[PDB]
Design a protein around this ligand. Structure first.
Ligand SMILES: [Zn+2]
Lengths: 493, 128, 286, 125, 486
DNA sequence: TTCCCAAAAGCCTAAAG
DNA sequence: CTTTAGGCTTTTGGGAACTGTCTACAT
RNA sequence: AGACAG
């Protein structure tokens, strides 16, 4: 070929994204700060421990983690363990850190752990097998699905659904949406579902709830059941949130009311808890909000600081997403390209369980022996790796007969349902409003690149995608123009 | 089709300890060679290792120089690759802290050779 | 216681042881018672208571396982259920059928070993097999037949082929021994129940692959030839018990060992004859 | 050029058997030990045995599945191949008088398991 | 005439065994020796994840030779039989304890479990054993509560001996009011016709091959359903492994517990290891893993040929016709069978004139046929043409051709296109099987199965041939008829 | 996972001693 | 009048393509 | 049970 021709072809060609071509997992896992030499995984571990540090008994400080010497790495991998110094001969690309805690200024036994040590091109070698580490396209703060607001926490994976209900106002029948959410996992007379207003009435008094979350008063315009009790509200101080509370109240009361004899007991709390008495579950739900969720909700445009504020926002501001949603599940803009949160799901779960089962024992003095036993039983060597090859669907087996990492290696995205992969499910992908055509594919993902994994364009990643810091999918302006028009046609009626 | 010849890289793994010993497939009566050297060519019948189970009572039957060269398709364990395929390299792992060496004397020449080279390489890495 | 146881559951483990448851418761218761118661214381317171313680114781025881690893019970989750366990057999059955049909002939295999063998010896050995097939086959016979016939018949097949094939191979090996001159060992082939300096040097030259031995009290020891221990095993097997001869009368007369009582007296210088047989096999092979 | 270039052909006159007599899959060490794969292909599935039972009488199909399932029948087939002046065009592979039907391992297992429950499938009289 | 199920009298099977009868009652367990003997009789063990070498062996792994066939092993008092052809017989037996009248047939237990056993109450358990705890006020149903009340008011004794001895009256009461409520006529007739076979004295514990334990690094892999069976047997062991002899009521309770464990085991095993998509009936009883079978990419011959003509390649021909080549080598050349296998395997990846001549002579000696008869399968098997007979005619001399020259005409009968699809090939080992397969030969799908007098569309010529015929016939190489005449 | 479809549970209503 | 039969509505559970290759698996 | 081939 003419060298000048190749030069002009290069000049008249847009370059790809070095962030995405060289491996986005590489950047989000194995990138060192210049001020201090610390990987992204190490910083993520420090962030998780700093978040969980609120649950320490005043002196169990988490000092940090260090990088283990390969001398110590080999000594710790190959332990005695009943007179058999067992070693696994395999490439097994890994690196060891040690988490160090402090108690009143004195060191404990450091807990060593192993970490994947991704290579360029999203490549790892685990137990002698070459795996490809793909990012997971996640929703930033919460997802809107067919009829649901799906919000994940560190522990729970909650879903906010809604139904319709009837109530009489001024003698005329009216219909309002009641928003519910099953939270007691063991849960799975008309059968009803746990309304959010039911949780409000279970925690606070009914009059207390109305006064605290609205400028509305309650007696015992007029609101009454359909098919006794009477709730009277000032003629001018009305709101949609108060009406939703009334609808949820009647939804929880109309089917049950064999336990309602004196209406004044409705202002109490034990009666509502009986109607729903797992006070441990109630307290976990109350203190079931963490820093990462709050930060993500702030990023999206919500101002949650307490879970009750979250319930108020969902009941008043985010309920718009339940019946007529401005955003759509079909698109892929405004989404994160998360890697660590899914790779370290095992480690995140281990840290959470350690914290909870450590706070739940006692609030008394802690001995060094008991702390060491807890750390030994919590932070093992392969805590974050035992389930990498079986429980994580973002790590696939590499079978690329090419020298190019773009075509199959570095351009794979995995949906959350396909990311877990522990379900072993098949949604049939046809009767799904999620997998509809959207112009977002053309900018995020590759249409006409249709593997049997995801036959639509969401399976792979568009290599020119503009992705900013912290793995947020940004929108390139220019093509956006054309893209906008296409979207309208996709919804032509 | 000559212009389109894919290149295929393959790895053959064989374990020989107290269970079995390598046969002689790339050496004459004088020189014992279990597997091809680096840069060597596999036999016209692609066969490597061909390890035979170790039995003392069958010594004058399956340990004579003719029996070592001869391969019985049944009762022996060979790894069969593409014939004429040039050998890229060999990786040798040895457990050197067994007082009775399971491999009888004579059939550990190339093994010790490559293991010594690899040991020097890793020792130099460790020294660095 | 128862219751416681128842509650627781148881586981398985327881168963383981065985036882038843128832027873346881018772035882436781016883234881417681024883233881416681016783122781315681018562018173115281512280312590514791017683118751517581117782318761625781128862638871523780128851558871144980826791404490222481091993010796624990795990319920595997099983592309079907019968073939869910990875435990195969080392040998294809068709190879065994072929080796049976092969060993059913003796003249071809004998001429494969040595072309210069009279057929009258083969006929006498087959006539003796026609009577000897009722009784049992003993390990020394199989070992000698494996040693003598490996240039035409694999040794390990002797552990898979049927009894009639083993009897025919014993007849062929006895004929080969009788022709070679090792009549004493040939006598010990179709039977019913009822190393010197020059040899060492020659066998070491013929069998350069020798078993390594443990260093005694720190000082390393010289290796021991595997053919030597095989010869010792055959010698011990032959001297294990007394025997009744069921074979050709001509070979029995040539053996220079005749006893009025219906017992096959083992010659004092039998290990030397076995060593000579092994030396002849080694010379023939290499 | 693409992958799936071939070289995965699996021709097997006779396949090594499990202790419970039935052909099995090939483990890595035992699959990399033969020139070309030596797998026992499941060319008689439910659909294939349906087509055979319908197009041909169930007799020959049961005979094929008995030769495959019963190790003695397969040994007889190989013996017939080896002990014939013409290995091709063998008059009868398995002499059913010497080897009667009903010796197939899966069917014997099924019948024994039912008999341990107190039942047995038998033809109507 | 059909195929129905028949109840088997376990007493007849026990009497017809006439061999080494060892009972599971006499395993006191709780010690190394008896536990090891029980593990030898039960628990077919695979010590390591490695291929075994004992083609023929006894119950113990001590007689590794195969010529000792039918020799009773002194250690086990069991004859030596082929491992693959080992007879499938009940491993153990269970007899009635010293204070139990008889044993209930497991089929009867499973049949009664469908109706008597209920979530809110276990009628069979209440009727049979005494150590059953229940609360009447805890019954959250109404029909079940009424059934329980009626049963309580009737007032039967809760002993196993009473249940067995007075089974007629108890069963009639179960029929009468509401207890089964369906299939009354069939079940009553079944009980009336096979009453004697429902209470056998002896009960067989299934074969050693039924229960598999595979020991390996990280423990000993077992199955789930086996567990139930184990418990049942262990229960009967605990009947006799008691320091203090059990009272007759306790013996009846333990016997009923063991019988219920057997019933649960058989139900679960029939639901899981047979009924499921992978299993015994739907995986092995109707075809699995043929021998003398090959599978290869279909590349064909675009040459003047026959439709019943197939070309198996060098490697497939050598491995598939392994014993045919061995027979030819032994018959012609003074070669031992070991040398024959060595030659054949050595010359699979390499070409020679001798083996090619042997293939040609085999195909020629297949006299009243084009070659060696065989069946050819395309998956999924939808139509008659998915499976079709062909005749092998020539192994290809090119070692690089791992291809299978099926005829062009027979392509449309399956959905076979040369886009990189592997098809299956089964070698017919008999002339009788070839004659039987002649009904699956391609000439059977010529006539359309959906049109009265029409040849099926599967016989239509392929694309290139049709286009060639078009470009030849439909050409203006002559003037029109009027101009041709004028 | 979600849709198919049969079988057992459960419920109101009705007929005979 | 009391005590069960009968048929309709709920709830639950087994089941959901064929062949072949490869991949995963102790603490 | 995930991918791939048809
Ligand atoms: Zn035995």
């Amino acid at each position: 070929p003419d060298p000048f021709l190749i030069e002009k072809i290069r000049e008249n060609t847009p370059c790809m994204n070095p962030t995405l071509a060289n491996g986005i997992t590489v950047e989000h896992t194995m990138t060192r700060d210049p001020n201090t030499g610390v990987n992204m995984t190490r910083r993520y571990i420090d962030s998780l421990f700093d978040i969980s540090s609120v649950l320490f008994p005043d002196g169990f400080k988490y000092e940090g983690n260090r990088a283990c010497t390969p001398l110590k790495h080999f000594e710790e991998i190959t332990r005695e363990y009943n007179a058999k110094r067992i070693a696994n001969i395999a490439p097994t690309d890994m690196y060891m850190i040690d988490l160090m805690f402090s108690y009143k200024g004195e060191m404990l036994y450091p807990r060593p752990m192993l970490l994947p040590a991704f290579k360029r091109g999203n490549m790892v070698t685990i137990n002698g097998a070459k795996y490809i580490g793909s990012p997971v396209l996640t929703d930033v703060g919460f997802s809107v699905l067919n009829d649901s607001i799906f919000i994940p926490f560190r522990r729970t994976k909650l879903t906010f659904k809604q139904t319709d209900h009837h109530y009489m106002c001024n003698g005329q029948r009216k219909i309002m949406y009641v928003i519910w959410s099953q939270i007691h996992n063991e849960m799975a007379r008309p059968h009803i579902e746990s309304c959010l207003a039911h949780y409000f009435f279970c925690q606070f008094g009914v009059t207390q709830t109305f006064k605290q979350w609205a400028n509305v008063d309650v007696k015992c315009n007029i609101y009454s059941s359909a098919t006794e009790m009477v709730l009277v509200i000032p003629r001018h101080q009305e709101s949609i949130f108060a009406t939703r509370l009334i609808a949820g109240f009647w939804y929880v009361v109309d089917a049950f009311p064999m336990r309602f004899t004196r209406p004044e007991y409705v202002d109490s709390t034990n009666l509502w808890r009986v109607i729903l008495n797992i006070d441990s579950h109630l307290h976990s739900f109350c203190n079931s909000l963490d820093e990462m969720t709050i930060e993500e909700l702030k990023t999206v445009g919500v101002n949650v600081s307490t879970i009750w504020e979250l319930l108020y926002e969902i009941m008043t501001s985010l309920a718009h997403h339940l019946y007529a949603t401005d955003i759509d599940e079909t698109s892929m803009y405004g989404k994160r390209l998360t890697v660590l949160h899914y790779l370290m799901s095992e480690f995140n779960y281990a840290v959470s369980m350690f914290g909870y089962m450590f706070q739940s024992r006692r609030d008394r003095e802690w001995t060094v022996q008991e702390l060491n036993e807890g750390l030994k039983r919590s932070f093992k060597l392969q805590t974050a790796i035992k389930r990498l090859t079986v429980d994580h669907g973002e790590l696939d087996t590499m079978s690329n007969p090419n020298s190019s990492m773009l075509i199959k290696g570095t351009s794979i995205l995995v949906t959350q349902d396909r990311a877990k992969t522990a379900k072993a499910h098949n949604k049939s992908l046809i009767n799904d409003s999620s997998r509809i055509i959207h112009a977002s594919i053309a900018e995020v993902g590759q249409y006409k690149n249709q593997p049997k994994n995801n036959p639509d364009g969401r399976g792979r990643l568009n290599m020119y995608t503009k992705v900013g810091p912290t793995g947020l999918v940004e929108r390139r302006e220019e093509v956006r123009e054309i893209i906008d028009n296409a979207q309208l046609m996709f919804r032509a009626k | 089709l000559k212009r389109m010849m894919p290149t295929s890289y393959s790895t053959a793994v064989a374990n020989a300890g107290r269970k079995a010993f390598f046969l002689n497939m790339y050496g004459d009566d004088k020189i014992y060679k279990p597997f091809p050297d680096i840069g060597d060519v596999i036999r016209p019948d692609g066969v490597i290792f061909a390890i035979r189970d170790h039995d003392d009572d069958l010594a004058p039957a399956e340990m004579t120089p003719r029996a070592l060269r001869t391969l019985d398709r049944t009762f022996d364990r060979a790894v069969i690759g593409t014939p004429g395929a040039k050998v890229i390299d060999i990786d040798i792992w040895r457990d050197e802290r067994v007082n009775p060496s399971p491999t009888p004397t004579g059939m550990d020449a190339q093994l010790v050779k490559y293991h010594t080279h690899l040991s020097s390489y890793y020792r130099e890495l460790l020294k660095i | 216681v128862k219751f416681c146881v128842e509650d627781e559951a148881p586981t398985l483990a327881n168963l383981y042881r065985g036882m038843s448851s128832a027873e346881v418761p018772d035882i436781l218761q016883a234881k417681v018672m024883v233881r416681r118661l016783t122781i315681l214381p018562l018173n115281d317171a512280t312590s514791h208571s017683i118751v517581s313680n117782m318761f625781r114781y128862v638871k523780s025881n128851l558871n144980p396982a826791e404490r222481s690893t091993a010796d624990r019970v795990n319920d595997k989750r099983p592309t079907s259920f019968i073939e869910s366990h990875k435990t195969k057999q080392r040998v294809t059955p068709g190879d065994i059928v072929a080796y049976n049909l092969d060993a059913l002939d003796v003249v071809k295999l004998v001429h494969k070993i040595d072309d210069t063998v009279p057929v009258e010896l083969i006929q006498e050995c087959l006539d003796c097999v026609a009577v000897t097939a009722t009784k049992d086959i003993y390990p020394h016979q199989i070992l000698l037949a494996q040693w003598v016939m490996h240039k035409a018949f694999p040794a390990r097949a002797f552990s898979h082929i049927n009894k009639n094939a083993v009897n025919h191979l014993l007849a062929a090996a006895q004929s080969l021994m009788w022709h070679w001159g090792f009549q004493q060992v040939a006598v010990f082939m179709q039977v019913e129940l009822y190393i010197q300096i020059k040899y060492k040097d020659v066998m070491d030259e013929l069998y350069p692959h020798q078993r390594q031995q443990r260093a005694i009290n720190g000082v390393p020891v010289a290796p021991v030839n595997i053919a030597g221990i095989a010869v010792q095993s055959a010698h011990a097997s032959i001297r294990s018990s007394n025997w009744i001869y069921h074979g050709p009368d001509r070979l029995f007369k040539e053996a220079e060992q005749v006893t009025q009582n219906k017992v096959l007296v083992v010659p004092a210088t039998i290990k030397s004859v076995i060593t000579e047989l092994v030396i002849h096999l080694g010379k023939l092979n290499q | 050029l693409l992958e799936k270039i071939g070289e995965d052909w699996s021709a097997a006159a006779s396949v090594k058997t499990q202790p419970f007599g039935l052909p099995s899959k090939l483990n890595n060490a035992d699959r990399a030990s033969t020139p070309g794969r030596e797998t026992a292909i499941r060319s008689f599935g439910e659909s294939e045995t349906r087509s055979y039972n319908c197009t041909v009488g169930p007799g020959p199909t049961a005979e094929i599945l008995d030769q495959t399932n019963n190790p003695l029948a397969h040994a007889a087939v190989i013996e017939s191949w080896l002990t014939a002046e013409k290995p091709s065009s063998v008059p009868v592979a398995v002499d059913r008088e010497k080897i009667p039907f009903g010796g197939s391992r899966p069917v014997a297992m099924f019948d024994h398991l039912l008999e341990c429950s107190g039942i047995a499938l038998e033809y109507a009289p | 005439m059909g195929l129905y199920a028949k109840v088997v009298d376990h007493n007849e099977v026990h009497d017809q065994f006439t061999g080494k009868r060892i009972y599971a009652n006499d395993y006191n367990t709780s010690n190394s020796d008896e536990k090891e003997e029980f593990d030898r009789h039960f628990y077919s063990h695979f010590q390591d994840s490695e291929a075994i070498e004992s083609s023929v062996s006894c119950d113990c792994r001590a007689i590794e030779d195969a010529h000792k066939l039918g020799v009773i092993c002194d250690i086990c008092n069991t004859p030596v039989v082929n491992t693959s052809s080992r007879p499938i017989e009940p491993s153990m037996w269970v007899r009635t304890p010293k204070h139990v009248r008889s044993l209930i047939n497991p089929r009867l237990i499973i049949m009664l479990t469908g109706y008597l056993v209920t979530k809110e109450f276990d009628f069979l358990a209440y009727l049979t054993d005494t150590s059953y705890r229940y609360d009447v006020e805890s019954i959250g149903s109404k029909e079940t509560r009424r059934k329980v009340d009626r049963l309580l008011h009737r007032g039967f004794e809760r002993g196993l001996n009473h249940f067995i001895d007075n089974f007629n009256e108890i069963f009639q009461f179960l029929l009468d009011a509401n207890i089964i409520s369906n299939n009354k006529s069939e079940f009553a007739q079944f009980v009336a016709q096979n009453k004697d076979k429902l209470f056998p004295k002896y009960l067989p514990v299934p074969s050693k091959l039924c229960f598999v334990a595979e020991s390996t690094t990280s423990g000993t892999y077992l199955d789930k359903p086996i567990e139930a069976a184990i418990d049942a047997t262990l229960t009967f062991a605990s009947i006799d492994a008691s320091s203090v002899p059990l009272s007759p009521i306790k013996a009846q309770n333990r016997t009923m517990r063991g019988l219920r464990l057997y019933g649960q085991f058989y139900e679960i095993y029939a639901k899981s290891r047979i009924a499921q998509k992978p299993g015994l009936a739907r995986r092995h009883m109707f075809g699995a893993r043929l021998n003398a079978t090959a599978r290869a990419v279909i590349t064909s011959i675009s040459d003047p040929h026959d439709y019943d003509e197939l070309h198996i390649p060098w490697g497939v021909g050598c491995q598939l016709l392994k014993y045919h080549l061995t027979n030819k080598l032994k018959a012609k050349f003074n070669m031992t069978t070991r040398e024959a296998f060595s030659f054949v395997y050595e010359n699979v990846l390499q070409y020679n004139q001798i083996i090619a001549d042997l293939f040609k002579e085999l195909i020629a000696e297949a006299a009243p046929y084009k070659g060696m008869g065989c069946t050819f399968h395309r998956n999924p098997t939808l139509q008659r043409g998915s499976t079709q007979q062909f005749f092998i005619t020539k192994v290809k001399d090119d070692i690089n051709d791992n291809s299978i020259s099926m005829s062009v005409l027979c392509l449309k009968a399956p959905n076979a296109d040369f886009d990189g699809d592997q098809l299956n090939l089964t070698l017919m080992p008999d002339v009788y099987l070839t004659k039987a397969t002649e009904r699956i030969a391609p000439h059977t799908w010529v006539l359309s199965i959906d049109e009265p007098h029409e040849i099926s569309g599967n016989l239509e010529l392929q694309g290139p041939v049709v286009e060639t015929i078009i470009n030849w016939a439909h050409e203006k190489y002559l003037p029109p008829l009027e101009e041709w005449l004028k």
